[PDB]
Structure formats: structure tokens, C-alpha cells
Design a protein around this ligand. Sequence first.
Ligand SMILES: C/C(=C\[C@H](C)CCCCC(=O)O)[C@@H]1O[C@@H]2C=C[C@@H]1OC(=O)\C=C/C=C\C=C\[C@H]1O[C@@H]3C[C@H]1O[C@@H](/C=C/C[C@H]1O[C@H](C[C@H](O)[C@H]1C)[C@@H](O)[C@@H](O)/C=C/CC/C=C/C2)[C@@H]3C
Lengths: 50, 159, 49
Amino acid sequence: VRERMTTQDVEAITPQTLINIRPVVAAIKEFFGTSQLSQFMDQNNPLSGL
Amino acid sequence: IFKVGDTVVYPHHGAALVEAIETRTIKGEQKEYLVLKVAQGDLTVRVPAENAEYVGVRDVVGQEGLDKVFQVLRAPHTEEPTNWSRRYKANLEKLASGDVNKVAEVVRDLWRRDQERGLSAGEKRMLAKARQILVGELALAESTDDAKAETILDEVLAA
Amino acid sequence: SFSDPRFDDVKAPVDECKDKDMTYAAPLFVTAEFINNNTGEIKSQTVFM
Ligand SMILES: C/C(=C\[C@H](C)CCCCC(=O)O)[C@@H]1O[C@@H]2C=C[C@@H]1OC(=O)\C=C/C=C\C=C\[C@H]1O[C@@H]3C[C@H]1O[C@@H](/C=C/C[C@H]1O[C@H](C[C@H](O)[C@H]1C)[C@@H](O)[C@@H](O)/C=C/CC/C=C/C2)[C@@H]3C
């Protein structure tokens, strides 16, 4: 965002054009899928779930 | 110059409404701001009336500019830079100028080009965006049903 | 600048997500504000995060 706040022309930008949500959604996706603290929940009995 | 509920034109955000005159002070001076929300982007814009003309907000056009751009769009013999990059930069600057005659000239030139050829994804998006904001300005300058304004623009284009 | 995080309703219930392998989620919304300093214009938009 602070990169393209200069190369874009003034009195032409809008926050819909500034923000790229792709690194945030990729960071969330890579945190849940394939990270060692986000584990596949085991359930062979409710005690082991708990 | 303006009251509440007036239709007005921005440099490039389409036409818009003024919803209220905001009295939000800054640095201990009650500057007369004005909330101005637009149609397409669904966003609001707060501008002080002092530099309203500095940023160049423009009142809507009338019948003289209406038939002026109707003669500009109908005007033949516009030459073009054969360098397409110079052409793209040139009509991009003309579109960002915010002038109604320049926007009408841009859409009629790009219509005459893609009517023969079919130009580009970028030039097609160029024509789509500029024709959309010109149709919105026409349908708030004459208030005559923007779809029907699109058809009447298609009428005067091929005429 | 950024302001006002705000969620929506979930796109699908739990059992349908477990059936059709969709992830149970909900969209984020954020009120963003762009301020020019010299002339002075604020722009409030609702960015889907
Ligand atoms: C070594 C380790 C986890 C092991 C794989 C499992 C626990 C080892 C302890 C033990 O031997 O019982 C570390 O775990 C994390 C950090 C990095 C390490 O992972 C690691 O470096 C190793 C793997 C990290 C993420 C793996 C994701 C996927 O690997 C498979 C599928 C995905 O998740 C895994 C699911 C593991 C659940 C386990 O649960 C245990 C029993 C079974 O061993 C498993 C069913 C239960 O005893 C449960 O109570 C214990 C949970 C572990 C507590 C959290 C530790 C932090 C499954 C093995």
C-alpha cells in the first residue's frame, strides 16, 4: 500500500485500489493449513477430544 | 454555490450527490466541509468548500454543453498517434482531466477505433469506464433513464 | 487509516461445511479512510478484508 501510494497518480486513488488483501488471506490460509500448532483434531472418545 | 441534495460532478468518480454540509472543525477553525457520496464506488468524500474549486468539483452541464458534446462526438476527422503507447497515455490524461468534452471525444474516438478493429483488454476497459461515467453524467444532466441514455448515445454515435 | 472491524453471518452452517468440504468462515469488513493532507479529502470505503 505504501509502495503504490506514490507510483499511482494523486487525486486518482481510492482505498479499493490501494489495498491488496491477498497477503492477509494467504497468511490466514497458511496458518491454519500446514502449521504445527494447528492440529488435526483426534477423536476416538470425548475425553481425548477434551 | 451549493445546497444540500445537489447533483455535482467530480474529476473522476462519476456524478454524485451532496448529502450534508459537514461542520467538522480542524486546527480550531470551523471549516465548511461537505459530505459527497458517489454512485459507483459506494464511498463518501469530504471536501472543504474553499478548495472545492482547487480539487475542481464541477457543477452539471446544461443544454449548451449537451449539444456541444453532441457535436464533438459527431465530429469526424480526428487523427491519432500511431504509437499506441502515446495514444494510451494521451487519452488516459484526457480522461483524467475530467472535462466533459474531452471524455466525449475519448469515447467517440475509441468507439470509432474498436468499431473497425476491436482493440484491447486495456482499451476495452478504458472505453467501458469512460463511457460509463459519461453515461452517468448524461443521465444526471438530462435525467433521462441511463439505459435509454446509453441507447441514445449509441444512436448519435453511428449517426 | 483503518477503522471498525465488523463481521457478517457465516456463509454455511457446520454440518453442510463438513459435508461439502467447505471451511466454516465469515467475511471481514473494515472501514478504511484515505486522507490527503494538502488539499484535504477523506474517503470512507468498506473494504472486504
Ligand atoms: C511432535 C509434535 C506433535 C506430534 C505429532 C503429536 C504429539 C507427540 C506427543 C506424543 O507422542 O504423544 C509437536 O506438536 C506441536 C509442535 C510441533 C510438533 O509437531 C511436529 O513437528 C509434527 C506434526 C505437526 C503438524 C501435523 C499435521 C498433520 O500431521 C497428521 C495430520 C495432521 O495433524 C496431526 C495430528 C496429531 C494429533 C495427535 O494428538 C495426540 C495423539 C496422537 O499422536 C495424534 C492423534 C494427543 O495425545 C494429543 O493430546 C497431543 C497433541 C500435541 C500437543 C501440541 C504440540 C505442539 C497428524 C499426525
